[PDB]
Amino acid sequence: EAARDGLRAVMEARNVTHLLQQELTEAQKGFQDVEAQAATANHTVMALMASLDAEKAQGQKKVEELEGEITTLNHKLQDASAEVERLRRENQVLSVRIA
């Protein structure tokens, strides 16, 4: 009668451990998903950080190309303007002689 009760008790405990074990399998599936979600996010962060680096570097290099081109064009404009002025003077000098 006391062996009845105990035995019943131990059997309920068995069925409950089994209910528990299951939930441990739901838990685990839950972590794993949560891990994957986080791992994925950490991946994107890294991917995007790298992209931002590359895009800074490319944009920076392209600017320094163009600015190099601008300066070269300026030096050539300087010489062309010098030449114009030189010719303007030399024009007014010749202009006086005859008229």
Give min distance, CB of 93 to a second copy, in A.
Answer: 5
Q: Tell me, by CB under 8 A, how many residues bind a second copy.
A: 98
Give min distance, CB of 61 to a second copy, in A.
Answer: 5
Give min distance, CB of 71 to a second copy, in A.
Answer: 6
- Give kind and range of the element (H or E) at residue 60: helix 2-98
64 vs 54, 61, 67, 69, 71, CA distance in Å? Answer: 15, 5, 5, 9, 11
Instruction: Say how many CA atoms lie within 13 Å of 36 toward its Cβ.
Output: 5
Please tell me the distance from the alpha carbon of residue 23 to that of residue 26, in angstroms, as a whole number. Answer: 5
Q: Which of residues 57-86 bind a second copy (CB under 8 A)?
A: 57-86
Q: Which of residues 6-25 bind a second copy (CB under 8 A)?
A: 6-25
Please tell me the distance from the alpha carbon of residue 91 to that of residue 47, in angstroms, as a whole number. Answer: 65
Give min distance, CB of 69 to a second copy, in A.
Answer: 6
